[PDB]
Subunit: 357 residues, 3 copies
């Protein structure tokens, strides 16, 4: 033919063979695994045990997936009497006011005192209650702060369980395909001679005893392998004719050119004339290309979709506490009633009165 | 034979073949990947870097899994005033004495009240500032706790995508690894030898197959003949031609066909040849043994999961309502307004009346 | 040859075959799955709806991975008392004047105390109400933070199961994809042609096969001959010059057997035929080359993990003990019991005695 390349392709046919023994262990066993989350995820600070209980039934589901695998003097007396009458009346009136005012003062100062006493007592109780509310808030705040770190670690260990459950899930299927290879070799090798090369020994198979082994079957295949390979120009196919019309194609062996064309088998360079036994008439060089390919996809780029900051900004609230200092004034500077020592000066007046006595 | 269906089965046997070239790339390479968790999970707000540090050694373990891949009387009048004077003078001292004692007593007490107002006020101011100190710190500590949680929810969210992406990189890696066994198999059963099995290197049979190394995997330009026009004939699942199944003949290396009586043929060509002991291995007397066998895989991701979130949340959730309390207080100090002390001015008027009266 | 074991190896060669039918379903379909994370992870208390929004694009990425799949003296007598009276009268006003000044001074001061008590009390009430406002809001904000965390633990709990279920749906999808290659392989090397290899379609060789499309995958009914009673004979791995080996004969297309001397036979039948150049490709002089090779996979999920939780928690954990404090206070406002003002009543008696005396 005249394919994409020239008719000439060069092949190495096998001149001599040597016997080859291959010992192979195809593994067919992976012990099933039970994940006890309270133990694997933690079992340490019991804070983890309680915290995991809130976490959920993750353990049940992960295990489901894995289980799948004279008269004037008298007038002077009257003058004294008039002075006395005025003085006596005045003394009582001033004293009467003194009595009224001091009496009024006593109730008022006492009223002030009770007021001071009551306010202080209530003040003490309110503050203690302020302490009670504030004290509990702090402890409740502390459990909330301490719990979070135990929460971040539990979540961290759980991220490793999901990845390890994935490794155990991928290892289990991988072994399962391996048992189909092992079933296949047992049927197409131990129980029969296998035409396909490379499926039990390099070169063809002349037997294949198998034995069971610790987790999987160990097969001691035995067969011949090629040793020295002769090389000859050969034709992809010989369209015998002057360019394409009707053509001959090698069947069971490449068509080779001696050192003209002569047929040979794949096993041995055994030149034999090209005859209708070795050829199935192929078409007139209808060489049909059929490109086909096999592919897989990779998705874990290191960066990820976006930077953390943009993602955090759409939902994050920077949140600044409106810290406040409760407003207060020390307006009660003093109540220093003073110079009451003038009462001592009034006492000096009493001393003059005592001297008058 | 008389199998589950009638002896008749219709087979299309090849009449003319045409040459065919397949160019095939079997991929045998996936770069191993290293996950830098501080960078993948963040490297952004450093809040993630500190927060992830508490998160743990998740990075180390995930990497292990991925790395796996009348003168006297006048005197008596004076004596009468003098007796009034004796009583009055004594009375004046006593009233003044009480006045001195009371005002003195009042001064110490009012001053005692003053210290009391002063001390309580000062202590009150200090306690409040401390109330502010404790309350102020609590709020800031509360704020870090609220702000940290959102950064914590996002870190967990990015980590959930890593476990799924480490799983895709783990599944892709084994999938390529089986693919290299196909590539090893084709290299051994195709490039290095002619392969009897059809469909393993070229449609139809194979007459050569040169491999070449390619960017990540081997590229094989296999060449072989493919069937082009297929003739069709009634054929028999194999039968002795005998009336009653005592023993029967089974086609070997080719189907048995009926011409337009029975004649043998190969799989490659409708080359009729008489049925002879060369083409047949004697099969048993119609012991047609059925053997149903099947291959299955399981689907587990139903959209809704085991239970609704609310029931799951209720068994452990506490609705939790803060027992908010307003500290109880009373404004009982309505007033201390001593008033009508103006009567002291009235007393002053009384003093004024007798001042200069003598 | 003289391989690791002795030349002798015992083989069972088929004597009679019986017809065998296998019905096989190779599954080639796994419906693709779309995960609605708001529904799967939550759908419940809308707290899980809003909280998940903080988690971010976990849903988008997981979906990408899954989508990948004497007359004068008398006047003087009274006058001398009157002279004392003149001082006494003036003194009485002077004492009263002090009384007026002091009581006036007291009034302003006691009123100064009154304002002090009133102002402090009012301010005290306002500050406390504000203490209640700040403390009250903190508690409610504390409550949302505690309540949100439990919804956060459960949402993160359900999200952990999604990562494992997305991994099972991802592993099932590739596993089906390899299965379609088996199905493509059987269709090309079985339904479209007779297959030399045993095992690909029917125990024993294959004499025809018909596929038929089935609910999710192809159901192939295959028919072929299968061996029934197998004769056993001593056979030789290979046969040499029956001496120190110079060159040897190796069975080709069939084992070499010893009768009850050596005689060749095919794999299909114990048909003894003399060893001849047709059945032997000359092998080398017992160059028996061993080539040990094996297939292995690795297991990583030991129950324990790298370290106990406590050590891991300790390196980063802060036990954190709240410095709870009780704001310091003193109840020093002892009763200001001004008392014994009853002496004012005693002073009143003094006035009464002289008012009567007048
Ligand atoms: C294959 O054929 C092309 C087209 O004639 C030719 O250019 C090329 O030299 C041939 N192959 C090689 C690599 O020699
Ligand atoms: C290969 O076979 C030939 C002919 O039997 C023989 O001359 C040669 O020694 C053998 N060995 C080698 C070197 O391949
Ligand atoms: C040569 O090939 C041509 C087509 O390029 C064809 O038409 C012609 O018949 C062929 N010649 C012969 C007789 O082989
Ligand atoms: C990491 O991501 C950056 C940006 O996509 C890229 O430049 C770099 O090559 C990536 N490395 C790997 C090995 O993925
Ligand atoms: C919050 O504000 C600070 C500056 O006070 C800034 O540095 C920080 O990045 C902000 N946080 C956010 C919104 O990421
Ligand atoms: C003061 O009064 C007392 C009691 O009436 C009296 O005994 C005494 O003599 C008086 N003293 C003077 C200074 O006259
Ligand atoms: C197939 O080959 C035969 C024999 O050469 C020939 O008679 C027949 O016409 C060919 N058919 C086609 C499709 O050319
Ligand atoms: C989702 O799961 C439910 C069972 O929980 C099932 O009935 C339904 O078909 C699934 N898909 C849809 C369409 O919601
Ligand atoms: C909490 O109580 C409110 C009001 O009764 C209710 O609407 C809400 O669903 C409850 N949350 C839960 C599930 O505890
Ligand atoms: C002041 O308030 C108290 C509260 O107990 C009340 O008993 C008292 O009568 C009030 N005084 C005035 C001035 O009304
Ligand atoms: C009375 O008081 C007035 C005003 O201070 C003064 O002018 C007068 O001298 C006083 N008289 C006597 C003697 O007390
Ligand atoms: C096998 O067939 C032979 C005749 O070919 C017969 O004698 C024998 O009974 C059959 N049974 C066995 C041993 O499989
Ligand atoms: C015979 O055996 C001896 C020792 O193994 C060895 O030196 C000699 O080459 C052998 N001859 C052959 C080829 O049989
Ligand atoms: C499981 O746990 C035990 C606890 O003693 C430990 O010794 C063992 O290594 C772990 N591995 C197994 C058997 O899964
Ligand atoms: C924290 O302190 C408590 C009380 O001392 C102790 O029992 C607990 O184990 C500590 N937790 C850790 C691991 O920090
Ligand atoms: C005061 O003196 C007056 C003089 O008329 C008299 O009526 C009154 O009863 C006296 N009061 C007392 C209690 O001394």
């Amino acid at each position: 033919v005249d394919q994409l390349n020239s008719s000439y392709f060069k092949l190495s046919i096998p001149t001599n063979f040597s016997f080859g023994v291959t010992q192979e262990y195809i593994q067919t066993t992976i012990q099933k695994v039970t994940v006890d989350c309270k133990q694997y995820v933690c079992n340490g600070f019991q804070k983890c045990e309680q915290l995991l209980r809130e976490y959920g039934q993750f353990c049940s589901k992960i295990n489901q997936a894995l289980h799948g695998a004279q008269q004037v003097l008298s007038e002077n007396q009257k003058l004294i009497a008039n002075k006395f009458n005025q003085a006596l009346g005045a003394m009582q009136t001033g004293f009467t006011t003194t009595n009224e005012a001091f009496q009024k003062v006593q109730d008022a100062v006492n009223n002030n005192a009770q007021a001071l006493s009551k306010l202080a007592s209530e003040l003490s109780n309110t503050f203690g209650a302020i302490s009670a509310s504030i004290g509990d808030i702090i402890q409740r705040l502390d459990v909330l702060e301490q719990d979070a770190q135990i929460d971040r670690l539990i979540n961290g260990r759980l991220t490793t369980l999901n990845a390890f459950v994935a490794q155990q899930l991928v290892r289990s299927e991988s072994a399962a395909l391996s048992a189909q290879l092992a079933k296949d070799k047992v049927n197409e090798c131990v129980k029969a001679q296998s035409k396909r090369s490379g499926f039990c020994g390099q070169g063809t198979h002349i037997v294949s005893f198998v034995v069971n082994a610790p987790n999987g079957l160990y097969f001691m295949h035995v067969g011949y392998y090629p040793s020295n390979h002769i090389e000859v120009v050969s034709a992809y196919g010989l369209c015998d004719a002057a360019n394409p019309t009707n053509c001959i194609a090698p069947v069971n062996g490449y068509f080779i050119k001696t050192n003209e064309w002569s047929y040979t088998g794949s096993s041995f360079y055994a030149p034999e004339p090209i005859t209708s036994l070795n050829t199935k008439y192929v078409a007139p060089q209808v060489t049909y290309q059929n490109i086909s390919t096999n592919l897989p996809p990779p998705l874990l780029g290191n960066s990820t979709g976006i930077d953390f900051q943009d993602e955090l900004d759409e939902f994050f609230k920077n949140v600044s506490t409106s810290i406040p200092n409760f407003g207060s004034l020390t307006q009660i500077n003093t109540t220093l009633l003073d110079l009451t020592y003038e009462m001592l000066s009034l006492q000096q007046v009493v001393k003059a009165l005592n001297e008058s006595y």
